[model samples]
Structures are given as C-alpha cells and as structure tokens.
Target: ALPQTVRIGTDTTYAPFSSKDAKGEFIGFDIDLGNEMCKRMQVKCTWVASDFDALIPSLKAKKIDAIIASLSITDKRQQEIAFSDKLYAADSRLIAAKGSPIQPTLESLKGKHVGVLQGSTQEAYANDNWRTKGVDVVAYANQDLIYSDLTAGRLDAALQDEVAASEGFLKQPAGKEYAFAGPSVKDKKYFGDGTGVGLRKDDTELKAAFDKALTELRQDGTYDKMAKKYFDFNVYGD
Candidate 1:
C-alpha cells in the first residue's frame, strides 16, 4: 500500500522542469507530473527542495522517498538508486548565437569556448569529446550561468538538455539571438535511458507502482496535455 504522504526530493533551480513560482510555491513540469502520479497512486506528496548533488543522499537518509527532479536514468545512477519508468524523454544538444557556424562536432567547436552544467553528463561528454579536440570546455554549477555566459558572448556555445535550451533559454529574451546549433545528442553512454523518477534501490514495489502510473499517464493522453502546458513541441520524443 502507498504511504499517506510521500516525501519528494527535487532541485527547483531548473526552470520549466522544476522551479519555484513568484509566490514561493513549487511549480513546473516535474512538480505537476509528480503530483498527478501521486494522485493516481492514491497518495499525497510533499515536495522538498535539495541541492542537485544532495538529492540522492537525502533519499538514502530517509528525508525523501523519491526524486522527481528531471533526474536522468543512467546506468551510473542505477547503481545508486532504482528509477521508475521514463516519465519523459530528453536529449542533449549544443546551442550558439543564431547564425553562428557551430556544430556538435569536435572540428566545428575546436578552439571555441563551450559551456556545460557542472556535474552533468553534458560536462562529461564535452570534456571527453570536445576538450580532447582542443575546444575550451567550461563547466558551470548551474544552467543559468551557462546561459549567462553565452548571452554575454563569453561562451561560443553551450551544451544542455534540448528542452531546457529551448524553453529555459532560447525562448527567453536573453536567448532570442541564440539557437540550437547541432544534432540532438543521445548517446546512452552519457545521456542514459531518459528522465524518470528515482527511488531507493530497496523500494522496488514503489518503483513498480510509479511505473504503472507513468504508462497510464501516457496511454490516457495526460502526458501530452501536461507537455503542451509548458512546451510548444512534443517532449515525448520517439
């Protein structure tokens, strides 16, 4: 049976995915999706904010029962915690000033300064591929700084989640002059399977419950409706 109230861990700094509202209430795609999942499971949810890096530790400490922060479902993460069925699909991409001759390749970005979120798979990919090819890959602690430097012309390009680049940056005023510059990067070695809810490895039963609800959400068109609420494009990519 589901708990009366499930504590949820999230990092709300990533806009569109998860973030706080002007009134200080939690809001965003993950927040709404998690709420709906809990409703379907017949449980209440309490959102708890934690540092992006601390979310897993908090869960292990019993501070939160699950993580629904757009966390990627990667093999490395699977070793630390189990993941529910994919709630959404996402790919990484490179973004640059509109009209810039940038591509998601070593030769194209060589000698250019590229920014990625620190501790993210994008950072690892950049360092492994671009940096080795002589690109100056810069890693920032948060997505905001990556966009900040890119907008200030300090970065030739930035690497991040495709949806985030579109909604959190490119569609905004500061990112109007910027656009995605490369093909969607979807290597499982880095990006993993997709985005999913994270639970303790021991919580297999809970994981199964969330997985069933996720499938129901998609089958009933609830997922598309929620996706349309924030994104003009289909986030449930095939």
Candidate 2:
C-alpha cells in the first residue's frame, strides 16, 4: 500500500529537526531520520518545505505522502490524521530575556506579548489557555521570525519546544541574553504524546512501515547516535 516515491512535507524554519542549509539542502535530525526511513522502506522520497501550519493540510490534500516535520501527536491532531510512533520527546518551554523574565502563565504574562508559531502546539495551547484571557499571544509564520521579533524586543517571550529553544536558539549567538522562563511546561493534553510522523489516517500500511523502520533504527542504536549529534540530554524520553 506504500507508494514507491514518498513525498514528505516539513517546515524548514525549525532547526535540529528540519531546516534548510546554506546551500539550500534539506538538513537536520528530521531530514536524517526521514532519509534513513525511506531507505529502510525501500522507497524514493522527496522533501517539500512549507510553512508549519500547512504541513497537515498539504498531507490531507495529497500534496505530500507524510509529515516528518517534528509534528506533535496530540489527540486533537490525531482526530485529523494518523501518527507513526513518536520520533522523540519534545516538551514545551518558554524563553525570554534574562533580566526579570516573567513566568509562563496567563496571569504572569497578562497584557504581555508572547510569540508563538502560527498553528503550532504552542499556539494552540496559548490561544486556549492564555490569549483568550489577555496574555497577548502573537502568532508568527515561523520559529525564525518568532526569535527575530523576540530579539527585536517586540515580544516579551516566546513559547516553543524546549529543545528547539535550547539548542536551535538559546545555544546560538543570536540567542544571547535570553534564558528559559521557569521550567518545562507540562500539559499532556496540550503538548500531546511527543512528536511523530504525520500521515493520513487511512494510510495504515504506510504508518506501519514507518513505525517498523523507526523501531529498527531505535533498536540498532542509530537513533541514539543521530540524537546525540543534536542533544546532550535524552531526546527519546521514557
């Protein structure tokens, strides 16, 4: 039931997961995992980079065969599409300027602008739990711009995946003077069951193929080796 050529959609704005290189080559952990999975599945794969919000929509419209875009596997999302087993653990965290950064709560951030990527898990969480209550949640098209606005002093803080903010931004030169606000956010309802490959609900065979390939990689220590390149802590949480 799997197609000979798999078309994968991902958002290149996120690093350590999916990103475009200086030479316009697709790069990052998600890229490596997808390539390896395609190899194991014995299928040719093409990567299509799009805005984060369009990932699932494109997949449903047959614009892509799967989504390896670091997509969080939330129940709300599962209602719309199926998911391969988790790729990695991606908890949520808040980032702000080092000096007197406020806590990541609706009351603490009241009237404060918090940047979130449009149509992201963070966005859905903030909008449901904060924006409606006056936290001034702002949605941007990509993570790069959220960091850009945060750097420009236009935003009080930005909410995103903890590891991405830590390794993709705070660890970078552009993220100087910024620090994590409080600890990791915990809301399994909002954050979902970590990140995974997004696929059509009817594409059970494809999902199964991906799951097997992923499990094989995990057992072979290839997943660990790849994860170590981007993270120091356990990327695959128990």
Candidate 3:
C-alpha cells in the first residue's frame, strides 16, 4: 500500500528537468511528471528541494519517500536503491564557448577546467575518464552555479544532460556565447539506461504503483502532453 501523502525529493537547480520558478515554486518536467503520477495513483505528493548529491542519502535516511529528480538508473545506484520503470531518457554532453575546440576526450580536455554537478553521472564520467589523468574537473554544488561560473569564464567547459544544457542554459540569454562542443557522451557504464523515480528497495508496493501510474500516463498520451509543454522532440528514448 502506498502512503496517503508521498514526499518526493528533487534538485531544483536543474531546469527543464527540475527547477524553481520566480514564485519560489518548484516547476519543471520532473515536477509535472511526479505530480501527474501521484494524481493517477490517487495520492497527494509534496515536492522537496534538496542538493542533487543528498537525494539518495535523504531517501535512505527516511527524510523523503521517493526521488522524482531525474535520477538515472545506473548500475551503482541500483545497488543502493530501487527505481521505477524508466521515466525518460537522458544523454550527457559538453558545453563551452561557441568556437572552443574542446571535446569530450582526455586529450582534448587535458589541462582544461571542466565543470560538473557534484554528484551527477557527468561528474562520475568526467572523473573516471578525464580527471584522473590531467583534466581539471570542478564539481559544483548545483547546476546553476556551474552555468554561472562557466559564463564568468571560470570554467573552460561544463558537462551535463544534453537537454538540460540546451534548454536550461544554451537557450537562455546567459548562454548566448556557448554551444555544445561535441556529440553526446553516452557510456552505459556511467550514465546508466535512463532516468526514473528513485525509491527505497523495500518499497515494492509504492514502486509498483508508480510504474502503473507511469504506464497510464504514456497510454493516455499524457506523457507526451506534459512533455510538449517543455520539449519539442522525443524525450523518451527507445
């Protein structure tokens, strides 16, 4: 049985996926998806904002009932918590000054400063593939900060979700001079399959309910409806 009110955690700094509005309200694709899921499941859900890095720990500590924060279904994370069926897909990429020669490679990024969300899959990938060698990988507490530093010329490039970087920053005025340096960087070993709702491993009942709710949303085209509000392309990968 699911709780009468589900408390969901999300990092509001990642826009299009998750972020706060001018009214201080959480507003994004993640918020829309989570709310719709709860509505179909016939349960009230409250959204909680937390650091991206703290989401998993908060779930394990019982501070939150679930994570609807675009949490990717990675091999390492699956060992720590359970996930609902795929909510959507995400691929990471590199963003830098419009004409920069930077690429998502060790030799290309070597001796260059790169920004990544502190606990994101991008950080994991950058650290393992670039940082250990010679690249300067700087991890920030949030995505906005990474964008800020990048705009201020403090960062050579920033790696994050392909869609987020496009809509959250590149589409904004602050990112006028920046563009994706290379193609999408996808490695199943790090980025995982796709994003999903994160829940405690023991919460099988809640997980099933979420999975069912997700299927209903897709079946009725509500998933496409909600996504159309923010995206013009397919966000759910094959």
Candidate 4:
C-alpha cells in the first residue's frame, strides 16, 4: 500500500507547471494536484525538487514515493517505472522570438539552433526530427534555462510540450520577446498518450491507490478546479 506521506518529485524550474512561486511557495498545476491527491487520500505530501532528469532515478532509489511533475509518459519510461492513470494529454509546440521565421514542422527550421530539455521526450523528439536535417539541438537541464538562452538570443528556438512551453515562456517576462513559432504538434511516438504520476515499478499497490484518488478527483470537480486555476481548460480529459 502507498504510504501516508508521499514524496512527489519534480523539476524546480518547469514554471507554471511546477515551480517555486513568489514567497517561495511551490505552486503550479502539478503541485496543486499533488496536494489535492494527498488531501483526498488523507496522505501527507512533500515536494522534492530535483533536476528534470533525476526524478526517475530518485524514484527508483526510494528517495521519493512518486513523481507528480509534468512527466511525459512513454513506453521507454514504462520499462523503469509504473504510472498512475493519465492526468493530462498534451501536444508539443515550438517557440521562437517574436517575428522569427522558425516553424515547428520538421522541415521548417533546418540548420537552426533548437533548444530542448535534456532527458525529456522533447529532447528525443527534437533530436530525431532535426538531427538529420543538420539542425543543432541545444540541451538545457530545465525549462527556465532554455528560456534564458532563448531570451538572450543564444538559441533560435525551443520545442517543448505545448503547456510547458506556454506556461514557462509565453507567460513570463523573459518570454515576452518570444512567440509560439508553430502550432502544437501531437506525436504519439515521443510525447506519449498522456502524462501520469510515476511510481516505482514494484509499487503496484501505490499506483493503484494514486489511480483511485486521481479518478475520484476527476469525477468530483476538484481536479477541474485545480486545472482551471492554472490552465484554460482541463488537459485531463481525452
């Protein structure tokens, strides 16, 4: 069974999805959902901030009970950890400075500098799609860093999950100089079917518990409240 105190792991820099807001409070859709799930399950919740790539390892190490970050679910990741029912389904988008000519289509930005988060599915997607085209993929450890590079003109564009990119870049001051360069591209191959909470592979009982709690929230309108608090619509439903 899952423990009463759940340690949720995540990147500290994936803003608007997960980040330390003003007053040093960890705030965002993921954090709010973690808190709400704990509330519903009657469990205590703790946020464990880590680099994006470290979350899975930390889960395997038992340093965290689950991952409630904006983690993308892919078959490759399923080899290592179990996932709860999906919380959101998202598309990926490309962002470039306002008025930049780059586009999200595979052939639109050939030979350009594209930023991606290291260890993320977006990185894999970008590399696979752009490498053969001679485009340079610059990997950063977090979304904030990607935005930093893009803002400073060090990068010509960044491609990430639409919500993550929009929340981290379009809504921030540094992102003001940028605009979404293309429409969201939904790829089942890389972006996965949906995003879910990651648990240890052996933790079937815990996964069940979280899944139950997640379903309840989805049905009771609690999840909707949280979703609306951060996003324009619920990304949970298909």
- Candidate with top lDDT is 3
Each prediction's total of clashing residue pairs, residues at least 3 apart in sequence or on different chains, is: 0, 0, 0, 0
Most TM-score-accurate candidate: 1
Q: How do all the candidates rank in terms of lDDT, highest first?
A: 3, 2, 1, 4
Q: How accurate locally, in lDDT, is each candidate? A: 0.86, 0.88, 0.90, 0.81
Which 10 residues in a row give candidate 1 its minimum summed lDDT?
Answer: 163-172
Q: How many Å off is the CA of 38 in candidate 1?
A: 1.5
State the TM-score for model 2: 0.70
> Alpha carbon lDDT of residue 144, candidate 3?
88
TM-score for every candidate vs. truth? 0.78, 0.70, 0.70, 0.68
Clashing pairs in 1: none
Candidate 1 or 4, higher lDDT?
1
Clashing pairs in 4: none
Q: What is the lDDT, from 0 to 100, of the residue 230 in candidate 2?
A: 84
The list of candidate 4 runs beyond 4 A from truth reads 94-160, 168-183
TM-score pick, better of 3 and 4: 3
Off by over 4 Å in 3: 93-160, 168-185
lDDT of 2 at 144: 89
